[PDB]
Symmetry: C2
Subunit: 232 residues, 2 copies
């Protein structure tokens, strides 16, 4: 049962770093891969939690620009896995009124990962109950640099004056400019850091650090974080 | 006495948000302005703490462009006060080998505040023991927007191609590109937020939220935060 909070104190936009999948599997003598598999159900449970509480925006850090520093085998697994999650869940997401918005760069992602993400976006683009910003091959600095590059192209083409480049001008060139600022930034684990996640958007966000590893995270932990947010 | 940490575990760059000045003065039945006055000595004690431990970069959020909680009178006082602090302390900073770097916008900030900041920069520009990034009329978003604007001007003048803009390109247009990433981000009080401070630079920073009101903050609290940092597991996505 979701907590009874006044509408004013419910976060419009919650961002979740889904960390500790590896560490969780080690503590249980399971392979790292099984932590990520367990993490899938955490995400769909948190999506249900957001739908029930009426949080209109959820951003999930699925795959960082910095995850390319992990082993070849773990990258191969994380690519295949994020693809298979989106394929297996897209019907449910469409049915529950979730609009999937892929944030990140195509970069060195497999074509099959880009295809699934692009199709999930197209399928769900008319949904309005919850916007899921699914961040795959995403970095906050990369997003800002891509915003400055796109702004630079408009300046070169003479669509924009360089003397009117302001914070509102740059904000228009973010991956999803219609998605508002992060109100609440949840770090599942004890790690107290942004890790390059929605950097521009999190400037004024409340940070809530829980000790729950992501595979043990569910709608109750999400509801707790929203309760902490409301009492602030 | 500063704690005995290996060089590898000493933060290269510490950033501090100096909050709780008001609440501290209220607990002692003094006006909020007097807590800011008391906060001055906290900052110089933390600067001594950084010098002793050998932290080469310190950034202090002295004055945010956005002061939305603050009364007009407290904002008027904090402008005059950040000016008077820098004027009164610049010789001591010069003597201790602290290089002052002003981060922020000229904007609505009084000419007298800009003058004192600019003179402190000129006086201390050859120092190398500690770089103090004194952030006055500063915002993280404002700095990134000013970087994009300066990049835009180079593109309009044809000094730069628009088609090859990367993270490293944009980073060259930050206020002080020679100052490295924040390793450790200290929020003095219990308030858990960045408050729009060194946003680009803090991407992979360790956050330490202490409960100390800023006027009670001194080198020992700074040393404690550095000790907490030395125990942190930094991964940068690896």
């Amino acid at each position: 049962r979701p907590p009874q909070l006044p509408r004013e104190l419910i976060p419009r936009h919650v961002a979740i770093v889904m960390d500790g999948n590896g560490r969780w599997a080690k503590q249980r003598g399971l392979p790292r891969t099984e932590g990520h598999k367990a993490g899938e159900s955490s995400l769909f449970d948190v999506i249900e939690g957001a739908l029930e509480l009426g949080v209109p925006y959820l951003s999930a850090y699925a795959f960082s620009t910095e995850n390319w520093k992990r082993s070849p085998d773990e990258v191969r697994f994380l690519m295949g896995f994020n693809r298979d999650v989106i394929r297996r869940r897209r019907d449910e997401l469409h049915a529950r009124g979730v609009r999937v918005r892929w944030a990140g760069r195509p970069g060195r992602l497999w074509k099959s990962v880009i295809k699934e993400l692009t199709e999930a976006e197209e399928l769900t683009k008319h949904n309005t109950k919850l916007t899921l910003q699914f961040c795959v091959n995403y970095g906050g600095r990369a997003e800002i640099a891509d915003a400055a590059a796109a702004l630079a192209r408009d300046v070169a083409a003479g669509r924009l004056s360089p003397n009117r480049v302001t914070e509102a001008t740059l904000a228009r060139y973010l991956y999803h400019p219609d998605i508002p600022d992060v109100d609440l930034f949840i770090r599942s684990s004890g790690e107290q850091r942004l890790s390059n996640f929605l950097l521009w958007q999190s400037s004024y966000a409340e940070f809530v650090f829980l000790d729950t590893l992501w595979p043990d995270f569910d709608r109750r932990h999400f509801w707790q974080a929203c309760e902490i947010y409301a009492r602030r």
